[PDB]
Subunit: 401 residues, 4 copies
């Protein structure tokens, strides 16, 4: 069984809701990132075995967002391409599946990622109209809210599951806003210092003049502890989750190229990192934010590594309440202190500041981890995120000098 190497890694900068990326369909945005990876590695696209594309909001795009990403990037028709939907983890699950395909000898060279345009998601008139609607109010559902953000069993916003974690673990409003403010500060330092320059592929928004988008635009440079504390609850009366301590609604795409040992040698691709192990876990949908805890457990149990071996960590910031609850549980289970976790986690900022384009985030945070691993020269890094419906995914990565 061949080791699995990451030989390329690029992401878009992340757009704000109705922001710079909002004109781009998800297939078109994703294709620009894959094309960037193709032009840099110079691999003949005909040698790719498959393209696997995380995508949640697929209504209105015509057949297969995933295949659109491949064809519009210049990958030939003979290379199959498709899409996967495990809500928030969709951009990491594509990688996990590519990992399995390479391990099982079913593939040697795979593009795996995710792409999401929450801006472009439309509104749904239910199919029950096909048989008729005699009278009264006709309600069209927001595709983004229902299909990416609404639990299918309790009909609650994901923000309610964040309140559930806050209430169950006693994570206070002030602790959530401290976490959120820190993530903003870390993101702004990373952006302004050029930290993201290597990992970001420029995206051109065709226009009256083409616009070039290359700098994350969601970080809030005009907030502070007092402003955060004065925000109103966003999801439930007298709740603690606000728009300031929750992640945003965003557009974005991100992809890896994964290669077997045979491919690395045959096509002279030099690995950035190795994927040591994967994990996918489930929890109660009502506290879906805790999904990283079984996911991380399953990934480590496939290795001789422990959480203490990780030197960098990316845990996606769906909600401050959710990440703090995850951190709290990770400490008890793995015998690390919260200060040890926090000092190495989301070191360049997280989704509260950078944004959460759902189908792409699981790949986004893996790209960010990879490039910071290389900069620091550390050996192991962990990436993981919670998933709507009560799941998580996780990747353990090892540096390849």
């Amino acid at each position: 069984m061949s080791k699995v190497y990451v030989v390329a890694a690029k992401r878009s900068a992340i757009g704000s809701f109705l922001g710079t990326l909002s004109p781009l369909k998800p297939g078109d945005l994703g294709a620009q990132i894959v094309k960037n990876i193709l032009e840099e590695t110079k691999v003949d696209p005909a040698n790719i075995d498959e393209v696997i594309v995380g995508n949640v909001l697929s209504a209105g795009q015509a057949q297969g967002v995933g295949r659109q990403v491949a064809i519009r990037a210049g990958i030939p028709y003979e290379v199959p391409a498709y899409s996967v939907n495990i809500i928030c983890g969709s951009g990491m699950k594509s990688v996990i599946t590519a990992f399995s395909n390479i391990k099982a000898g079913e593939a040697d060279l795979v593009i795996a990622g995710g792409t999401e345009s929450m801006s472009g998601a439309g509104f749904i008139l239910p199919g029950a109209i096909r048989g008729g609607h005699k009278m009264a109010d006709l309600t069209m559902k927001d595709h983004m809210i229902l299909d990416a953000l609404t639990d299918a069993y309790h009909n609650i916003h994901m923000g309610i599951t964040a309140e559930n974690i806050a209430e169950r673990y006693g994570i206070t409003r002030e602790e959530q806003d401290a976490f959120a403010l820190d993530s903003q500060l870390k993101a702004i330092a990373a952006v302004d210092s050029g930290r993201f320059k290597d990992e970001i592929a420029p995206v051109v928004i065709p226009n009256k003049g083409d616009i070039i988008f290359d700098t994350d635009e969601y970080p809030n440079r005009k907030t502070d502890a007092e402003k955060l504390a004065k925000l109103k609850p966003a999801f439930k009366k007298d709740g603690s989750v606000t728009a300031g301590n929750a992640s945003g609604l965003n557009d974005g795409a991100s992809f890896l190229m994964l290669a077997s040992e045979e491919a690395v040698k045959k096509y002279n691709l030099k690995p950035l990192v190795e994927i040591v192990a994967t994990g996918t876990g489930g929890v109660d949908p009502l506290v879906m934010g805790m999904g990283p805890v079984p996911a991380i457990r399953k990934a480590f149990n496939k290795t001789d590594l422990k959480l203490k071996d990780m030197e960098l960590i990316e845990l996606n910031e769906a909600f401050a309440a959710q990440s703090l609850g995850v951190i709290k549980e990770l400490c008890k289970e793995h015998g690390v202190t919260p200060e040890w976790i926090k000092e190495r986690t989301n070191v360049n900022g997280g989704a509260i500041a950078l944004g959460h384009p759902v189908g792409a985030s699981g790949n986004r945070i893996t790209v960010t981890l990879i490039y910071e691993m290389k900069k620091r020269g550390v050996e192991y890094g962990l990436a993981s995120l919670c998933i709507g419906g009560g799941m998580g995914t996780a990747l353990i990565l090892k540096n390849v000098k």
Copy 2:
């Protein structure tokens, strides 16, 4: 690496467009079939590693149709479940990924299938109105037609890709209606003899009188014949050869396999029905999507010491008579078999023209139909494959576990 066994296989009967299954959401429909598999095999759901569910039309269902299938089937929260969209091949790609996971040692016991309620698909107001729509008509797109049936590169219906194959490969209208009629006759024969009784899990639809039990494929057309088929008019192209009579229908349905490693079979005392020998995923020009089974079958066989001539039964999805005849013509040339040899063993209980084509589940559906006919006939090798919107195909090579 472990062998990959099919230890369970069940499908719904296929519902007509706006027919018996139309009130059921795709996650509810799929869950009923997975729950049947769970009750028959008596496996503790907590020992399943993952549920992988093909599904194309996911709009308006709330988060993840895959997870809905698993949860509402009684599978614990700790078992992850999700969905895949490779259009028509979605119910077969899910098995192919389960096959990969087991070979890689990432999984031991997987439920993999697909579910699709074409009837319940809605209509899409585009997201550009979020920024405003100052004046003019506003068009809502049919979610079914656009997202399941419309090519994303040429903005043409799947039926137009059928015309392109009918033209390029010389498939006449008469040959298409012959294929279509024979498909009807074989399906009716299979339905009426009880041939599908083993493979179909009954589905309960809640109804005001009392609950409806649906267990009999309702799309086969018992009133058509050669002259009625010849009198139909072109459905997609002026002067074309493709009609509603020689094309598949719009349909609802679900279909699932349980896949097991060798450890799982021993640890859980599961009885393999068949073994999955190899898989194939191929690509072709979107303009001739129908030709997708050809590279996919080639890739599957290139992983084995088997040739197409080793197959005793074949299931090739009937997206369109023109598409299936075009595949047949090319398989014959490449693999050195006659058309007669193929047709005497392909879709022997009828195909999608008669039985229906619930897009995200057909890939799994035709595999369940293959498996049960292999058991009844006692043959060793069966092949299943189908084309895929956007120019792709998938294939499975199966071997009997007698």
Copy 3:
């Protein structure tokens, strides 16, 4: 000032909701009725001064349903035609305006009526989306329910105003259901004895074409027990049901009105003379009471009393509403319930026949006129309540 004469009167049969008239747009439906009136009177349409058309649910028809009625009936471009909306009174208010125009010498020959296709009314995405709709659900309003049936000041269905009348005036569920059953019986009797044959113009729905000529809403399979077992239609513990309220319906109705110079110059025998008109207002919360001030206003222009009426048409929007009106009218005008009952809605009413909102005001006038001619009575009164809290009324006098 000229007297005002009704020289022609025709209505469509009334269709059920999504029923036989459902394919017809209101402009088209109204045009067939006006063209019937043109064919029978044989008046040159170029001699018509105006066409005035009641119509409530005008969304989605393109410019001016009233002008479509005239143009598609064969009335030349030079004859102006337009629409008026006073909700349920629209088909009578058009006649009342025609009466004004003739009295004032502004016109000599007018076609006035109304037309409504409740079946064809669609659903409304609100105009606020022009500026954008960032997120959350988007509700399209039912055009028919909102714009024909929903009060603009209290956001209640017209059914709630019927409940308000039942409460304030002590009108019981059983009284409502008795009134409703009687209306069904009289309507069925009238239909089946051919009493509406004279007034009804046949309508052709292109399809083979369908000829519609018989009111299809009356419920031939109901009775006191079934009506009593229905559940309230508009509020828990209420008395208004689908069975003692009118329905949702499609239909059109028209009259031709003429001066004295027109009657002479074109030799048209008046059916009746319009003696006086009335338009009244009440609280929108009890809109059904609207006929009470309208009837009072019409009579105060004459030396006539309510006791001089030999036939009455009071539209049956709801049994609660109609019984409430009857109670107040007996009081004000010194007549008994039994006296009103025996001469009011003698051929059935809207509970059985239906309520095509923009046309009913003309519809009940056409039914009154033809029963006046069969009975040879001198005076007939027509009136109906209006959404928003209004009523309209007409006093008619037979022409020997």
Copy 4:
């Protein structure tokens, strides 16, 4: 018969499309103008006989825009109120009907105007959906474009009917753009000199509250060469552009009309007298010529000629439309184009000021009345073209 006097006249400033008036519903906008009239005249609202309100885009407003105008202006329930739809003429036709009602002795005091929120008009899913829609795309029609701007017989935009007039009369692109520019200059002149101050009632938009009292549509950054470089807006190779056509606008406008008895009884001073009215019809394909039969029918009721008119308002639906009307009026009435243009639309017209469809026919009458008063002239004429091929006209006499 009683004379008919205008005893009050007020209008909103006209809003741009999605501009300052866009948040106001048409009933609310109209009520604010009627309330201004009520507060200025200090008449007891209970003495009004009815309120008649032009309004075209009625969808999604709930029951009766006319009634909403009255109720929300503070007019009591007993005073009936309704709406009329003759497209572009609706705000003048309401007055014409008030004129008939007073003349006929059916009323003594009437509020008549129009109101339109083109910005607030929604989008229409068609009622055919009620019976089901098995598959394929679903189109929602723009309520504004279809029901106010689209011909019901040729399915063409009103801008196409302007092309037909320009082609049939040889009105050149350059002649149109000069008319348009002149209109902008006269409008800007009048706005900035305070000429409209008397006639405009301020409107409060609840967004701190906004006070809107200045016409915002006049284009102060256009000139001859910028107009010459605009693309055709309606047909390939055509002459009509966005710069020589009216705009999409919001606004309301009302008059109070009084009998001789009412003037005496309620101590009201007439501003002007309505001498005569006219309503005409023309071919829908050249609907913009509608003012020609309307004007002709109005003068033919009097001993006056077009030559007696000292001020004229003719609504500028399209420069092509208005030049064709002027060309035809000159031939029929024996006046020169120079004579007409020196006294027509002296404070600008709809190209610059905007065209709130249901209100414009009242708006141009309000603008005429106040300019009549400022100049002290005796006779003025207002007229406008109407979708579907009609016109309306009022002849006014100063009451000094």
